[PDB]
Amino acid sequence: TIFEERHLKYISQLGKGNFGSVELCRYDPLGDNTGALVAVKQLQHSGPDQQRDFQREIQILKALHSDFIVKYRGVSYGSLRLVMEYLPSGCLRDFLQRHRARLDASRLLLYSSQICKGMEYLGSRRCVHRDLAARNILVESEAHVKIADFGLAKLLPLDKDYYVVREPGQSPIFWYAPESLSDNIFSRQSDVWSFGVVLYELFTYCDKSCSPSAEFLRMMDVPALSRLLELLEEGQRLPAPPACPAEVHELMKLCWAPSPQDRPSFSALGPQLDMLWS
Numbered sequence: 200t201i202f203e204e205r206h207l208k209y210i211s212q213l214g215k216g217n218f219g220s221v222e223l224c225r226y227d228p229l230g231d232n233t234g235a236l237v238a239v240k241q242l243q244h245s246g247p248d249q250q251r252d253f254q255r256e257i258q259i260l261k262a263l264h265s266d267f268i269v270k271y272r273g274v275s276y277g278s279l280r281l282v283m284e285y286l287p288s289g290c291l292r293d294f295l296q297r298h299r300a301r302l303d304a305s306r307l308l309l310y311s312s313q314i315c316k317g318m319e320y321l322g323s324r325r326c327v328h329r330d331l332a333a334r335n336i337l338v339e340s341e342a343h344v345k346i347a348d349f350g351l352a353k354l355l356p357l358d359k360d361y362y363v364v365r366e367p368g369q370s371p372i373f374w375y376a377p378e379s380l381s382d383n384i385f386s387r388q389s390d391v392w393s394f395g396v397v398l399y400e401l402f403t404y405c406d407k408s409c410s411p412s413a414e415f416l417r418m419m420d421v422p423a424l425s426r427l428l429e430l431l432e433e434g435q436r437l438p439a440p441p442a443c444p445a446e447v448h449e450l451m452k453l454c455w456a457p458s459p460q461d462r463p464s465f466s467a468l469g470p471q472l473d474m475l476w477s
């Protein structure tokens with residue numbers, strides 16, 4: 200659970216995100232290149248708010264125990280770094296693009312069921328992910344996906360089922376629920392809206408030409424956020440992906456219900472995805 204700074208050997212950059220970076224390191228106490236590979240997150244540059252938010256992320260991940268959530272390994276102190284298991288297949292978005300001629304509808308349904316099971320578990324922990332997208336899902340194997348990146352995650356108080364953010368988000372706007380776009384309201388029901396966008400991503404194999412951004416922009420002087428909110432309020436939605444099974448498209452539409460209270464729960468979605476055959 201405690202990793203010594205001097206034994207973590209830098210190998211390469213895995214990613215850069217919101218005020219932080221994830222690096223591939225080898226935890227090599229023998230110094231002979233035989234140690235295990237780990238994914239290590241740290242804050243890129245100082246900030247008091249970012250530091251509090253980083254400690255929050257570590258506290259959230261440390262207490263999550265699911266086959267469908269990236270495993271917390273430990274921390275290194277200077278909390279300097281968050282140590283996690285390394286998944287060499289990487290993000291689901293790039294994985295789907297490379298293996299599209301190999302993965303069938305059954306396989307996409309299996310991934311959908313696994314993400315929905317991880318999300319049902321997050322909900323049971325009163326955790327709001329706030330950044331669910333195929334780029335934030337990791338691939339353990341050909342038949343196993345895991346939710347990652349809890350950098351924007353929040354724990355709901357026992358007496359409040361949503362939360363309000365002071366400043367508007369910094370993520371691509373095409374995954375946000377209408378209530379998040381209009382009032383900065385986030386809940387487990389806005390994670391359900393984002394999951395509908397994840398299902399769309401899976402069934403387009405994350406093809407850039409019909410991505411949520413390429414397609415919403417194509418359907419779209421007025422600000423882009425306000426224009427997307429206008430489209431959504433009118434009842435306009437992303438179209439059924441090419442060759443998408445009708446039942447899968449119908450589920451995406453339920454996730455995209457205008458009112459958060461009308462969206463299905465992750466517990467109700469789960470058996471439905473499993474019935475379609477995971």
Ligand SMILES: *CCC(=O)N1C[C@H](Nc2ncnc3[nH]ccc23)CC[C@@H]1C
Pocket residue numbers: 213214215221238269283284285286287288289290291292293334335337347
């Ligand atoms: C989309 C490109 C991609 O693979 N990622 C994931 C990467 N994070 C990561 N990779 C492997 N193992 C891990 N364990 C925890 C986090 C990771 C960061 C950049 C992008 C999003």
